[PDB]
Amino acid sequence: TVYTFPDEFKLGAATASYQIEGAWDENGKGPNIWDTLTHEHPDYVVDGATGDIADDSYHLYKEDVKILKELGAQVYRFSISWARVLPEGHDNIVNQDGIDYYNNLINELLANGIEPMVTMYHWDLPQALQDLGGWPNLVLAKYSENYARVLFKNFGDRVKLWLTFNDPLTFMDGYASEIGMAPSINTPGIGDYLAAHTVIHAHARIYHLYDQEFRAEQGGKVGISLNINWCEPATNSAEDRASCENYQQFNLGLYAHPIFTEEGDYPAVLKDRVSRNSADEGYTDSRLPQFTAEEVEYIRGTHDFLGINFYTALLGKSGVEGYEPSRYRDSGVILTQDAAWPISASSWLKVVPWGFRKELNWIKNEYNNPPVFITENGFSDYGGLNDTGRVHYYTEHLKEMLKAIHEDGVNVIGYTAWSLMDNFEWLRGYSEKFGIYAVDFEDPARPRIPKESAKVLAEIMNTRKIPERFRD
Numbered sequence: 001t002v003y004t005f006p007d008e009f010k011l012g013a014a015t016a017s018y019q020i021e022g023a024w025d026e027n028g029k030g031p032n033i034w035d036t037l038t039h040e041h042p043d044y045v046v047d048g049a050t051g052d053i054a055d056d057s058y059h060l061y062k063e064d065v066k067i068l069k070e071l072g073a074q075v076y077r078f079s080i081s082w083a084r085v086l087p088e089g090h091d092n093i094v095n096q097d098g099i100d101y102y103n104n105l106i107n108e109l110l111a112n113g114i115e116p117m118v119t120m121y122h123w124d125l126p127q128a129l130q131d132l133g134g135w136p137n138l139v140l141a142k143y144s145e146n147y148a149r150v151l152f153k154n155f156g157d158r159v160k161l162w163l164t165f166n167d168p169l170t171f172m173d174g175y176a177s178e179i180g181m182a183p184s185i186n187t188p189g190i191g192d193y194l195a196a197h198t199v200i201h202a203h204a205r206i207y208h209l210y211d212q213e214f215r216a217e218q219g220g221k222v223g224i225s226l227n228i229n230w231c232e233p234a235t236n237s238a239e240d241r242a243s244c245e246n247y248q249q250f251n252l253g254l255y256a257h258p259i260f261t262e263e264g265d266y267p268a269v270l271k272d273r274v275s276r277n278s279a280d281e282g283y284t285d286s287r288l289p290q291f292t293a294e295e296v297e298y299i300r301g302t303h304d305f306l307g308i309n310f311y312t313a314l315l316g317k318s319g320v321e322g323y324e325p326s327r328y329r330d331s332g333v334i335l336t337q338d339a340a341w342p343i344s345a346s347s348w349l350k351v352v353p354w355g356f357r358k359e360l361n362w363i364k365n366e367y368n369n370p371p372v373f374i375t376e377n378g379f380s381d382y383g384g385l386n387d388t389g390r391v392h393y394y395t396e397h398l399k400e401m402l403k404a405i406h407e408d409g410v411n412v413i414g415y416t417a418w419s420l421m422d423n424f425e426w427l428r429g430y431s432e433k434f435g436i437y438a439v440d441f442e443d444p445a446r447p448r449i450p451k452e453s454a455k456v457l458a459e460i461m462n463t464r465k466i467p468e469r470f471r472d
């Protein structure tokens, strides 16, 4: 039983637009902040790589569907490129080519028995909106509503699973470093919090829009995908446990407390630590923006499920470190990783499968067991088809998730592996491989070929259980 997926549980794979599509300026698509980063700052990216072509999924989407069908995916999670649909960011111009592309992909999926799950925003802000300041500028919340209206109107007759945002915890960091994630702006501890505030407002507007203009007719579900690492106390002390709770609240709670709790608002520890630090540093005003009571009420409850992106764990101990100002410093935890944990091709990603179970329990207890869809989980190597590390990563994480479901009563409702194929890995370019299908980026045809992990995942999806040879 503990090794069998619940009957209604949905299994599949995931991608993101800038990581796979290419066709960056084709057929009316406008420029986004990743076009800007990779074109103007190739020194920020391994090998000076760009997403100009990537997997060429703009042209090769039928090949993506073919491999999803081979895999036996029930659901395909992909994102829509805002600037492909609204090249100016604002909703004055709708690019028919973009509408046609996503309709073509959606229709191809449905014709092959695969359910689309659509992420509205996976990091590729139109440059015209970044030029207003991007996410720190609250005017983007209304622009995001207008973008979502276009998506619901055009695609919502066939798409019933939506994520507003993918991982704002990471993309807010684009406002916390001059050399980091797009748009690579150095306002740590100030502009990143403003970005979060706008994103939360935007999410809430999109959810209310769906309620008001679309839900009765379309009958779908709207969530948000949040990334979170497990944070294990470095020692069993109360003080180290406190630091791990700080981590959860500063990383997951930042977004989930306003939306998924009955109280709403930011977590108290976030408000209080930033208020105190801001006062101590001489600011008249806290660096953390505030919600009014009306806004707290508007934002809370804006969810039909919680998307979780889970990759790894950290150790947390009591203390403070980091630059002043920064969210890491504000969070009041000292973070490390255990040298004993298996490594990957990514410095940040260690293999800690039991952390996944711990995290799912933390979520269950904090948010009253919301339906959880695992929207990303995966592993990096530098290449190769005999990807035993990736196979072990998946089988262990799926086992731990299944224990969370069956032994712990966590309401996990689906899982999409990250990623369907090797793709443009942001600042890491093509140097880190997260796919279950390999892609030859030196071959203009970009063939997708299955790794051992794709074969094992196909076996899991077909049999609906963990094969015996991978059990404890």
Ligand SMILES: OC[C@H]1O[C@@H](OCCN2CCN(CCCN3c4ccccc4C=Cc4ccccc43)CC2)[C@H](O)[C@@H](O)[C@@H]1O
Residues within 6 Å of the ligand: 016, 019, 166, 167, 170, 227, 309, 311, 347, 348, 349, 376, 425, 434
């Ligand atoms: O990357 C795979 C997938 O990630 C996913 O983000 C979700 C996963 N992202 C979240 C953002 N994350 C940043 C991690 C910070 N990182 C460092 C920060 C600053 C300096 C140096 C560092 C080096 C090592 C570190 C060690 C310990 C902690 C943090 C470290 C990369 C993984 C994403 O949604 C997919 O699009 C993507 O393909």
Ligand SMILES: C1=Cc2ccccc2Nc2ccccc21
Residues within 6 Å of the ligand: 321, 322, 323, 328
């Ligand atoms: C991020 C900020 C830090 C600031 C100050 C002390 C320790 C830090 N932790 C880090 C270790 C390695 C890379 C980046 C880090």
Ligand SMILES: [Cl-]
Residues within 6 Å of the ligand: 234, 235, 236, 237
């Ligand atoms: Cl201990």
Ligand SMILES: [Cl-]
Residues within 6 Å of the ligand: 468, 469
């Ligand atoms: Cl066997």
Ligand code: NA
Residues within 6 Å of the ligand: 094, 150, 153, 154
């Ligand atoms: Na339209």
